[PDB]
């Protein structure tokens, strides 16, 4: 099926620059128009612009034409987004989309870009041990910027999972917890592991959570 994966996100200094990439699979990229859409935290969707297959037509939202440059590499089936002189108002999740019919029929999971003068920090992962239904989880503490993604047993366990929105501590670092309710009879038999990923610091932790 159609796959769209955004990368190159993360922390950027005010006035700084960053380049985003959208790697694709499942279709002949060279035959489609490709687009970028952004969304600031808790806000609506904003169209950035589009690029045609042979790169002869590149269209933007007039207010954003100075901060962005869209390009593509058909040989590598990759879409690019060059971001220039970034402001706090540019902090957003950047989505790679595929124009079809137009309408946008496929969207990537998006990549969050954070515009701040602060520095990148990797988190610490601690277990929340279980002690008919039992609760267990993971505490992901002291990281910057957002986001961290949490999965359980490499995505095999999804029912009863709640990953809480991150809370900004007094230190300036984010912290969150991810929890799961499971059968209490499976606590001595089944293995539970939280898979924590903090892409800005490139931190990958697999924590075994045992009673």
């Amino acid at each position: 099926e159609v796959q769209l994966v955004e990368s190159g996100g993360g922390l950027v200094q005010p006035g700084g620059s960053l380049r985003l990439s959208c790697a694709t699979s499942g279709f002949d990229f060279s035959r489609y128009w490709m687009s970028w859409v952004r969304q600031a935290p808790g806000k609506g969707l904003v169209w950035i612009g589009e690029v045609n297959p042979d790169s002869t037509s590149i269209n933007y939202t007039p207010s954003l034409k100075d901060q962005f440059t869209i390009s593509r590499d058909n040989a590598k089936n990759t879409l690019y987004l060059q971001m220039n002189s970034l402001r706090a108002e540019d902090t957003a999740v950047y989505y790679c989309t595929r124009p079809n019919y137009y309408a946008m029929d496929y969207w990537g999971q998006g990549t969050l870009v954070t515009v701040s003068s602060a520095s990148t920090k990797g988190p610490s992962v601690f277990p929340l041990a279980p002690s008919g239904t039992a609760a267990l989880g993971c505490l992901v503490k002291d990281y910057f910027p957002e986001p961290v993604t949490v999965s359980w047993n490499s995505g095999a366990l999804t029912s009863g999972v709640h990953t809480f929105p991150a809370v900004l501590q007094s230190s300036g670092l984010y912290s969150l917890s991810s929890v799961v309710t499971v059968p209490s009879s499976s606590l001595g038999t089944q293995t539970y592991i939280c898979n924590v990923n903090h892409k800005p610091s490139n931190t990958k932790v697999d924590k075994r959570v045992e009673p």
Binding site: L45, A103, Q109, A129, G137, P165, V167, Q169, V179
Partner: protein, 213 residues
């Protein structure tokens, strides 16, 4: 640039209800109007294109109508998995523009939280810090009170709350409260308790542990 206006901005409805959302274009856009769904913490998904054409795999209970400047999006029978923000988008003139979105919430029956307490791990205590987590699982409505008690004495600081969005299967909320102390302060006391107040509870529920057990 074409201005896209959505109404209502927000709405609450019950499972089984018929829901209608309107989209208004600042000028005539013919039938070049699309509708996207954005479920909590997920990327947007195409539902309807060209005013009324259903995208592949989209539930049959969804439909679109209208022409020119006025359009309508309809859910014939509301289901728990419809908790989301819905966006209309014009594809008539450049730059393509979106509506500001309609947040759809689910009204349901009272549900009491399941309450769980988590002592700090032996690993965290090595770094000289202690985090105590209180979990309020799957409750309705959102309004809930949590009090921390250390040796039956109320805590007047160093706790933080986090709340999830409505669950896609049962329309419930979940809440975490985290109490953070230094290992020194943590080792000064024995009983750690979190007291929970909620509409679904006849009286406050307390979950506790003794440090070391």
């Amino acid at each position: 640039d074409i201005q896209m206006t959505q109404s209502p901005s927000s709405l609450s409805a019950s499972v089984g209800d018929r829901v209608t959302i309107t989209c208004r274009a600042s000028q005539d856009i013919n039938n070049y109007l699309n509708w996207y769904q954005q479920k909590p913490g997920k990327a947007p998904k195409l539902l309807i294109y060209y005013t009324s054409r259903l995208h592949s795999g989209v539930p049959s209970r969804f439909s679109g109508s209208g022409s020119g400047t006025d359009f309508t999006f309809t859910i014939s029978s509301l289901q728990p998995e419809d908790i989301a923000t819905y966006y209309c988008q014009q594809g008539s003139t450049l730059p393509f523009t979106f509506g500001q979105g309609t947040k759809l919430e689910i009204k349901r029956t009272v549900a009491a939280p399941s309450v769980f307490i988590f002592p700090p791990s032996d690993e965290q205590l090595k770094s000289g810090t202690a985090s105590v987590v209180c979990l309020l699982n799957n409750f309705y409505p959102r309004e809930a009170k949590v009090q921390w008690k250390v040796d039956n004495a109320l805590q007047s600081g160093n706790s933080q709350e986090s709340v999830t969005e409505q669950d896609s299967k049962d329309s419930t909320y979940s809440l975490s409260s985290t109490l953070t102390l230094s290992k020194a302060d943590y080792e000064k006391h024995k009983v750690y308790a979190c007291e929970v107040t909620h509409q679904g509870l006849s009286s406050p529920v307390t979950k506790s542990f003794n440090r070391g057990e």
